[PDB]
Design a protein around this nucleic acid. Structure first.
Ligand SMILES: Nc1ncnc2c1ncn2[C@@H]1O[C@H](CSCC[C@H](N)C(=O)O)[C@@H](O)[C@H]1O
Ligand SMILES: Nc1ncnc2c1ncn2[C@@H]1O[C@H](CSCC[C@H](N)C(=O)O)[C@@H](O)[C@H]1O
Ligand SMILES: [Mg+2]
Ligand SMILES: [Mg+2]
Lengths: 186, 291, 291, 189
DNA sequence: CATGTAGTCTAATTAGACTGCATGG
DNA sequence: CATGTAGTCTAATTAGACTGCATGG
């Protein structure tokens, strides 16, 4: 039960950005000071050779982020590789069962996972994904344990529309509900 | 690493076998004298399930496709004392020139073992005994062997069935079983030469045969593809009852479901060498009830 | 008829088996406890010979095609205490619309049994014990049953395997064995109904199946060609190990020579009902040595 | 079989099968003119004859066998005449200690094909002998009669006998086959 | 009025080569 | 240089209706 925390107790976030850098995106929402303190954000592009001992010595984490390449075609690796490696480190970053503080995780997909990779992702992450539309106001799938990313009612769009669209402000609105749990910076 | 348990506190073993095949794991455990309290098998091959149910008279609970096993299933069907499994290697072995690797094709099924293993692991604060084992081929890309070792957080020990059987079978064995790196020793009941596996009035040309696959050409030995057996002066291939003796299975173990020569070799070709698995499961009879 | 032999004066039996098939005659004598001194088998089917040599470990001397056995061979290989044989019935049975009778095709191979029987008969003035037996189908012409009875100079006794097995098999039996017309009695280890012959987790629709031939459609019962077994809620045909138990043969008796379903059913369809032959050979224990 | 003096030769007791040779043996001087009880017996269909029938018909000295000569009126298969001739022959053979001569012969008038031929030689323990009369200006014989297995007739090409058989589509040729039996039995004139 | 120690014919099926190359011996 | 928990084809090979009728029930 991840209840809300009083404002005078909200410690600053310590996140783990995997396969993409969201520091310049998390800064804009004031989750971390521009002054370069070391422990606020850790970013790794290639995970292949990292061990649980690396994740544990990198300080405890409150947020673990996951993201696939955004149609950049700079993909040496299969699309399922980004999901499997993200699941391997989340168990490394998860703390002891007794929860001292809130722990959140998120994995987003930039429409690079086919239907076969999708049901594998929702099964390993233990929840079906929600779809956030950003392309046509006038789009990414998100797996996350954060409540307000499985709570509010976004634009219910069809899969035939998602198929035709395949032929950052919205993913910034799902980073927002983590603000009622940690420090606010301006 | 695990402390020893006295004989009185020993309870029957509870096993979760993913990609069970022809129930080699249950056969080995029951052949060591271990009481099998529960053996949950994840198998989708009808002929393979038929072997396990008939040869073991329904002591195995089949739980179809591993990708449909939920977290609640592991908790309902559990707790498990042993989690074993060998994932298909048709997309990992070098013998296939069109293998898709670990992240495509049927190589993804390795993660299903990794996923359900974490579900089966005892939560922290539960110092109860728990063992696991994963088998696969040695003829895989070093990138595949590396990544497998990363998810299981362990390095494999290679055991070749050449030391305990009459055939070459080089396989990797990830796990945490007691004494997996110990020197492999040959038993008295092990048939080490091909002549020990043949029937009456049949002569073996070699002492050891090359690695047996699902194909009928892995029986043809050498680069010239020579028949391994002579009977009545004429040449001949190995028999199904002889392939079973080579792998260490009981005779007529795959004589079910009206299976022919091709079907029985397919099940045996991708199975485990029984005396190798016995070497791995041998130190488990000091933590569970003996029969 | 033939005088009784004291227990100490008994000697191992010497058998000449024509059209031996899968060595049913030798299997019965060995299961009765009779010490077999010599078993000369005339058979031309390589797969049938393979069964007899492997399952009996070379105690059977194979003497190929019966038409090549000379008078000198009967004297050299003899003397014989028992001469058994079942002639091919593919030209005698009513089930064949194009059967060629007793004097054409394979039906004339009966006279080979008649020919070598007179060769094996003791000469005038030799009061030593001598027995023989000939088996063939019931569904033959009256002209063929008449002539066969004239050459053997005796009338057959019909014994249906329905009394001791789980299948219809009506067969004629010429011979001079002790107590052939005696009432057929069921044994303690006779699997009388189909459910006794099936494997685990298999249900039998019927209690007794129709006559099993070499064709796979004789397994489908009745006029509507019904599958005789239900497994996991699905219909299914009989298995090879189940066909063996129906005929009374040991389990996996035809698991030889990489034979498949159709091959094993071909050898079993021709064969004899083991408990019927046991009923006929039973009174031979009081004329030959035991073990 | 040794030779018998003339003052001891008993008359033949023949058994003719499938073909009556009474007119042939009487002509050569083996049978007796007066139709008294004793001489050959003649049967056509032996399907219902048992060992007791042959034994009570008196001990036999000659057992004759023959197939229909291109009769085209065969209700019986060609091999049927051989197997039945075999079955009755062993009914006619006497006690093992044979007192007197015992002869038998089988004649085929080009009816048994190749497959039936080797069967006849296996059962009669003898390869046949060909006796021709077709172009003296033919029948095959299996017989334990010595001078029929001793004297050699004119060699006949096998490719020729089968060509003259169907292009043609039995008493004067086998008359020479009955000839050497005079030495062992009585001569009537 | 259902049954059978099978043979012919045809469509499935399956048994065998053809392929393929990183890599220790 | 020989080896391999295999995937294609192509070609044997097998597996399955259709047949067939005397005959006691
Ligand atoms: N999706 C799936 N779910 C469960 N089992 C599967 C599966 N896909 C393949 N398998 C089975 O996994 C097995 C791997 S072969 C290993 C067999 C087993 N280790 C033995 O000793 O015999 C195959 O038999 C295959 O039938
Ligand atoms: N010419 C011949 N010589 C010897 N055996 C022959 C033969 N022709 C056929 N056979 C064999 O005779 C057998 C008759 S079927 C009877 C088999 C035997 N009674 C059993 O119990 O199995 C067939 O197996 C066939 O292979
Ligand atoms: Mg280890
Ligand atoms: Mg009788």
């Amino acid at each position: 039960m991840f209840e809300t925390v009083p404002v005078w107790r909200r410690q600053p976030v310590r996140v783990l950005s995997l396969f993409e850098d969201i520091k310049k995106e998390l800064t804009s929402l004031g989750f971390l000071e521009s002054g370069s303190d070391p422990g606020q954000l850790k970013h790794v592009v290639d995970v292949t050779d990292t061990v649980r001992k690396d994740v544990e010595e990198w300080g405890p984490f409150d947020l673990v982020y996951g993201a696939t390449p955004p149609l950049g075609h700079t993909c040496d690796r299969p699309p399922s590789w980004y999901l499997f490696q993200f699941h391997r480190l989340l168990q490394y970053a998860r703390p002891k069962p007794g929860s001292p503080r809130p722990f959140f995780w998120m994995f987003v997909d930039n429409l690079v996972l086919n239907k076969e990779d999708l049901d594998v992702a929702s099964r390993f992450l233990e929840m079906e994904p929600v779809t956030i539309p950003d392309v046509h106001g006038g789009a990414v799938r998100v797996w996350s344990n954060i409540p307000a990313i499985r709570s509010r009612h976004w634009a219910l769009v069809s899969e035939e529309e998602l198929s035709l669209l395949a032929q950052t402000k919205l993913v910034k609105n799902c980073f927002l509900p983590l603000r009622e749990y940690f420090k606010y910076f301006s | 690493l695990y402390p020893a348990i006295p004989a009185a506190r020993r309870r029957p073993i509870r096993v979760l076998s993913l990609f069970d095949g022809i129930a080699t794991g249950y056969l080995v455990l029951k052949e060591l004298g271990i009481k099998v309290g529960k053996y949950v098998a994840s198998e989708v091959c009808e002929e393979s399930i038929a072997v396990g149910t008939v040869k073991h008279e329904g002591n195995i609970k089949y739980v179809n496709d591993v990708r449909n096993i939920t977290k609640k299933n592991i908790e309902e069907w559990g707790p498990f004392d042993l989690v074993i499994g060998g994932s298909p290697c048709n997309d990992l072995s070098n013998v296939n020139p069109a293998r898709k690797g670990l992240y495509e094709g049927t190589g993804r099924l390795f993660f299903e073992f990794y996923h359900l293993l974490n579900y089966s692991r005892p939560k922290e604060g539960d110092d109860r005994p728990f063992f696991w084992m994963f088998e696969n081929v040695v003829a895989m890309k070093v990138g595949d062997k590396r990544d497998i070792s990363r998810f299981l957080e362990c390095n494999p020990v290679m055991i070749d069935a050449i030391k305990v059987s009459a055939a070459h079978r080089a396989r990797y064995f990830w796990g945490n079983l007691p004494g997996m790196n110990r020197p492999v020793i040959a038993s008295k009941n092990d048939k080490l030469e091909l002549q020990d596996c043949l029937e009456y009035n049949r002569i073996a040309k070699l002492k050891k045969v090359q690695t047996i696959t699902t194909k009928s050409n892995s029986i043809k030995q050498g680069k010239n593809q020579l028949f391994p057996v002579v009977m009545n002066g004429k040449e001949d291939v190995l028999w199904c009852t002889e392939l079973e003796r080579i792998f260490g299975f009981p005779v007529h173990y795959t004589d079910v479901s009206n299976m022919g020569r091709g079907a029985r070799q397919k099940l045996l070709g991708r199975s485990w060498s029984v005396p190798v698995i016995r070497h791995l499961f041998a130190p488990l009879k000091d933590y569970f009830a003996c029969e």
